[PDB]
Design an enzyme around this catalytic site. Sequence first.
Site, PDB file in Angstrom:
ATOM      1  N   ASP A 285       0.808  -1.218   0.000  1.00  0.00           N
ATOM      2  CA  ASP A 285       0.000   0.000   0.000  1.00  0.00           C
ATOM      3  C   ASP A 285       0.854   1.286   0.000  1.00  0.00           C
ATOM      4  O   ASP A 285       0.472   2.317   0.603  1.00  0.00           O
ATOM      5  CB  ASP A 285      -0.937  -0.021   1.205  1.00  0.00           C
ATOM      6  CG  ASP A 285      -2.325   0.525   0.907  1.00  0.00           C
ATOM      7  OD1 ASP A 285      -2.578   1.054  -0.210  1.00  0.00           O
ATOM      8  OD2 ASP A 285      -3.177   0.407   1.828  1.00  0.00           O
ATOM      9  N   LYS A 287       2.038   4.508  -1.629  1.00  0.00           N
ATOM     10  CA  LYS A 287       1.492   5.525  -2.491  1.00  0.00           C
ATOM     11  C   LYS A 287       1.487   6.834  -1.723  1.00  0.00           C
ATOM     12  O   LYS A 287       1.300   6.832  -0.503  1.00  0.00           O
ATOM     13  CB  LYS A 287       0.082   5.196  -2.948  1.00  0.00           C
ATOM     14  CG  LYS A 287      -0.916   5.015  -1.862  1.00  0.00           C
ATOM     15  CD  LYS A 287      -2.247   4.576  -2.464  1.00  0.00           C
ATOM     16  CE  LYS A 287      -3.266   4.274  -1.396  1.00  0.00           C
ATOM     17  NZ  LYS A 287      -4.621   4.563  -1.912  1.00  0.00           N
ATOM     18  N   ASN A 290      -0.171   7.769   1.632  1.00  0.00           N
ATOM     19  CA  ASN A 290       0.178   6.989   2.826  1.00  0.00           C
ATOM     20  C   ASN A 290       1.590   7.285   3.366  1.00  0.00           C
ATOM     21  O   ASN A 290       2.076   6.623   4.284  1.00  0.00           O
ATOM     22  CB  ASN A 290       0.043   5.494   2.526  1.00  0.00           C
ATOM     23  CG  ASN A 290      -1.400   5.051   2.317  1.00  0.00           C
ATOM     24  OD1 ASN A 290      -2.337   5.776   2.608  1.00  0.00           O
ATOM     25  ND2 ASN A 290      -1.573   3.840   1.820  1.00  0.00           N
TER      26      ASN A 290
HETATM   27  N1  ATP Z   1       0.200   8.694  12.549  1.00  0.00           N
HETATM   28  C1  ATP Z   1      -0.586   9.626  12.008  1.00  0.00           C
HETATM   29  N2  ATP Z   1      -0.437  10.951  12.234  1.00  0.00           N
HETATM   30  C2  ATP Z   1      -1.261  11.854  11.662  1.00  0.00           C
HETATM   31  N3  ATP Z   1      -2.269  11.507  10.833  1.00  0.00           N
HETATM   32  C3  ATP Z   1      -2.505  10.211  10.531  1.00  0.00           C
HETATM   33  C4  ATP Z   1      -1.654   9.178  11.114  1.00  0.00           C
HETATM   34  N4  ATP Z   1      -2.081   7.989  10.661  1.00  0.00           N
HETATM   35  C5  ATP Z   1      -3.131   8.234   9.848  1.00  0.00           C
HETATM   36  N5  ATP Z   1      -3.362   9.553   9.773  1.00  0.00           N
HETATM   37  C6  ATP Z   1      -4.452  10.167   9.018  1.00  0.00           C
HETATM   38  O1  ATP Z   1      -5.577   9.457   9.508  1.00  0.00           O
HETATM   39  C7  ATP Z   1      -6.463   9.149   8.443  1.00  0.00           C
HETATM   40  C8  ATP Z   1      -6.528   7.648   8.225  1.00  0.00           C
HETATM   41  O2  ATP Z   1      -5.353   7.169   7.588  1.00  0.00           O
HETATM   42  P1  ATP Z   1      -5.132   5.594   7.440  1.00  0.00           P
HETATM   43  O3  ATP Z   1      -4.399   5.435   6.152  1.00  0.00           O
HETATM   44  O4  ATP Z   1      -4.486   5.103   8.718  1.00  0.00           O
HETATM   45  O5  ATP Z   1      -6.698   5.143   7.388  1.00  0.00           O
HETATM   46  P2  ATP Z   1      -7.400   3.876   6.665  1.00  0.00           P
HETATM   47  O6  ATP Z   1      -8.839   3.951   7.027  1.00  0.00           O
HETATM   48  O7  ATP Z   1      -6.625   2.618   6.913  1.00  0.00           O
HETATM   49  O8  ATP Z   1      -7.235   4.196   5.097  1.00  0.00           O
HETATM   50  P3  ATP Z   1      -7.562   3.105   3.958  1.00  0.00           P
HETATM   51  O9  ATP Z   1      -9.014   2.818   4.217  1.00  0.00           O
HETATM   52  O10 ATP Z   1      -7.272   3.848   2.679  1.00  0.00           O
HETATM   53  O11 ATP Z   1      -6.624   1.987   4.230  1.00  0.00           O
HETATM   54  C9  ATP Z   1      -5.931   9.898   7.248  1.00  0.00           C
HETATM   55  O12 ATP Z   1      -6.508  11.203   7.270  1.00  0.00           O
HETATM   56  C10 ATP Z   1      -4.447   9.950   7.522  1.00  0.00           C
HETATM   57  O13 ATP Z   1      -3.764  10.992   6.828  1.00  0.00           O
END
Ligand code: ATP
Lengths: 496, 475
Positions: A285, A287, A290
């Site tokens: 993943d 990209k 991320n």
């Molecule tokens: N460690 C962090 N610090 C700041 N922001 C974060 C952090 N981890 C994730 N985010 C933000 O939190 C949100 C979720 O990101 P994440 O990729 O973890 O979610 P996800 O639901 O797994 O996404 P996907 O469904 O595409 O896999 C996004 O807005 C991301 O930019």
Amino acid sequence: SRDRKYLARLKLPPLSKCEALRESLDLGFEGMCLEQPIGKRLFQQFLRTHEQHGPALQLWKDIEDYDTADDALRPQKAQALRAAYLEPQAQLFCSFLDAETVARARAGAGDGLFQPLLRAVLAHLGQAPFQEFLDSLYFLRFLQWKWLEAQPMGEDWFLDFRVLGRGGFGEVFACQMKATGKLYACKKLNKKRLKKRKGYQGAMVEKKILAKVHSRFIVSLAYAFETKTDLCLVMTIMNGGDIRYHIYNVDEDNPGFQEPRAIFYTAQIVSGLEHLHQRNIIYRDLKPENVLLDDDGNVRISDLGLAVELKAGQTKTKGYAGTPGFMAPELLLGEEYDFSVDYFALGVTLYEMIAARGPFRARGEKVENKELKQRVLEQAVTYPDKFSPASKDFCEALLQKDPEKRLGFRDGSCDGLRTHPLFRDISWRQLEAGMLTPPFVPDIQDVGAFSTVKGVAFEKADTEFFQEFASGTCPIPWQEEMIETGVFGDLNVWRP
Amino acid sequence: RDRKYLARLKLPPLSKCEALRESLDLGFEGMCLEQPIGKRLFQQFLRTHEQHGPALQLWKDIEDYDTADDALRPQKAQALRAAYLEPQAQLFCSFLDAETVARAFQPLLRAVLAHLGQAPFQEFLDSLYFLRFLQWKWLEAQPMGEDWFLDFRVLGRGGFGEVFACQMKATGKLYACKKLNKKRLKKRKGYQGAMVEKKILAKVHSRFIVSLAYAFETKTDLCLVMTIMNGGDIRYHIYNVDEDNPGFQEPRAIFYTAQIVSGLEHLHQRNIIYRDLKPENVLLDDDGNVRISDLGLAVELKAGQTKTKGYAGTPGFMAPELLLGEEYDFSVDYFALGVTLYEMIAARGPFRARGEKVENKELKQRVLEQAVTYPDKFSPASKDFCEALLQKDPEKRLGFRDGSCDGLRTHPLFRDISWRQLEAGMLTPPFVPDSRTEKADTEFFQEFASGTCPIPWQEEMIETGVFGDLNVWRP
Ligand SMILES: Nc1ncnc2c1ncn2[C@@H]1O[C@H](COP(=O)(O)OP(=O)(O)OP(=O)(O)O)[C@@H](O)[C@H]1O
Ligand SMILES: Nc1ncnc2c1ncn2[C@@H]1O[C@H](COP(=O)(O)OP(=O)(O)OP(=O)(O)O)[C@@H](O)[C@H]1O
Ligand SMILES: [Cl-]
Ligand SMILES: [Cl-]
Ligand SMILES: [Mg+2]
Ligand SMILES: [Mg+2]
């Protein structure tokens, strides 16, 4: 600032309460005194107050100092190290070493100059010196600290104070560990939503991975706990904003990074991929959206929901997974695949950083997954004049449709990739150590609720998954927190 | 000091202290109050735990107040009172009764120490500081005999062997080593006397009695290591500070008498009779303070025994009851005190002239039958005091009453003596000396040679600086 109520609960316990821990625990020297920060400190305090172990400790400190010194000071430091610890008449000479080890140290010259010497010291220290440590109050202090580490620290300990982001399964809040005042990011996953959308496996792999892996190029898990409605991961806060945002935002009329910035981010991502690949994990993943920046301008990879842990003996995996446009031909075709897919993602990411568009579709063009698939399989990547000859070369090597011809992870490392001319102006030693000045030092709206999830009840299987997921505090990060934050300094006092 | 020997002063691995853990007196009073390292560690521990901070600082300040100078005490009382007894003050001692705060200093200390003996002590036992304590008690119990002391010059001669001045090789602290010849002890049957001296010098701890630190044997001797007294005996000083005008001047004599009393008191409070007080047994240190010595003829009264029998002591200093054959108590030591003070002032015993040779039989007759006369050198107060002490009947003799010499301290002789400052070693002395002047045998010797005495050793480890050195956590 930090909460009286919770600080007051960080208190080293009486010795009799550490009888349980005494046995049911890892006595391993590498685990205790090398990898665990508090463990390391206490071991070094022990060696510091026993005069015989002075020369080993100092050599140890002086090697670690040399590994992170600037290239200016190194020759000087390399000499002063040889002069102090490797001449038979010097005050801190190291009896316990072979002639063959002392000889190599004196004559070495290169990237890993004193790593055989460090291995020797650590091997020696791991013998008697360690055995004495175990028989000493410093080891007992370690247990007090481990006891504390194991005390419940769940939702009550964290104060969500703003919305950082939004996921598929919940928001990500900025939060403070009330006791120490340290800032974390807290990713919340709604339990009912996770069930209904069948995202348990994905949630577990992210936690398992963030838990076990410690790299400055991958967001680190500190705590895992549960509330009535959510599963929560507390991890490294990244306030910088994701790469993709910065690609289009740094200049609306002229989107894209200047190449030195893109090479710096590329080097950091690579080092993250290498830490994963060395542990038999395929990210799946990578990209731009991320890859996160932190307050200083340093990046880390994130979103490990699609990662797979390869088993013992397994060198390949199968499974359709990933984001359209970043999935490699192998994956698209349904073949078995390894780490190569991640390097294919890397190339598409480097591409986008430079050109403000994907290699397979123009900026702001709708292309359906079916078509975008055939492009990735059949289309030769064209490169606009934006790309230097070094960046063309590197992407070409990563965008190679045949995995076997693709650049990437060989011989248990990425060292091959690192010598590629694009990184000509990068001190990998320093990058990996976290020293290089980042190129751009940086400087969210709450949507309210997620829609109701009607008709979802929990079985025991669901509850067990939640208790299992909520595995508690991760040692290394917690210990790190205690040190950086001053709590270790306070509570580890003997006589203030 | 010595490298080889200082090298042997090292704290042991914790596994070597599991022997002491379960075979030591866990009593609070002995461990944290009486023993200086146990006290330090307890305090170090308390300071660490903030909940117990109020109690710690109070204890400290009461002890600082108790040893301050008269000029400063009033302000230290007010600061202690305002800082620990006002309900709104931060360091307020919640634990104390309302009944004891209204009353508030000695009573208060007993209250604070009472509290520190409950939970705080129990937490201390369950902490790293107690294990450190056990570490120091292991080093304490390790062998430190003949080899550790290097005798460097003779300080004096007794009837059973010489008394060297020596230094402990590892700490460099100077002591005096009274060496007894084994063969000589048997042939003169001194066993009991050397034994009594040792057990007494081991068990008592007072600034006015010489302190036993160590007790061991060579192939040829039985050796007692104790507080060094370089000032010489009081007799020597009566007849050699000025041979034209021998005697002391009154305030000086009054000074030493006060010190002797306090030492006498300490023995009596613990059911001991010195039985051999006399000037040649009172020694001076380099600062000019005295201590009683040569306890060989001491008797230890058992639980539930007010009196004893036995002809023992020095002719001319033994009191009437004892010479007669009767039962007697602590009063005999007060009789010897009187003789001693008399000689300090008049440069002569009360029962013979200076240089007059009289033998035991007649010397006895006088002690029993002669009215003591006082020349002009004695002021009315000196007179009254000696009269009190030399009263031939023990019933009419000034002495130890109601478990103390408080009664005797009231006498007009000591009107110019601040008692706490003497008893606390603060007062400057009136004369500072110049720095320039068969199998059943072998079992007795082994039993005699018990070894190191905790308190003085702990004391030695702190003064000499070894404690600071080896008790470090992160230097
Ligand atoms: N460690 C962090 N610090 C700041 N922001 C974060 C952090 N981890 C994730 N985010 C933000 O939190 C949100 C979720 O990101 P994440 O990729 O973890 O979610 P996800 O639901 O797994 O996404 P996907 O469904 O595409 O896999 C996004 O807005 C991301 O930019
Ligand atoms: N702590 C000391 N410091 C210096 N000198 C001492 C000390 N103890 C004893 N002496 C010296 O040794 C001499 C005799 O000591 P002491 O009376 O203890 O020996 P003794 O054999 O017990 O005497 P006695 O024959 O009366 O029993 C003293 O007069 C003194 O000079
Ligand atoms: Cl230790
Ligand atoms: Cl840029
Ligand atoms: Mg995810
Ligand atoms: Mg004597």
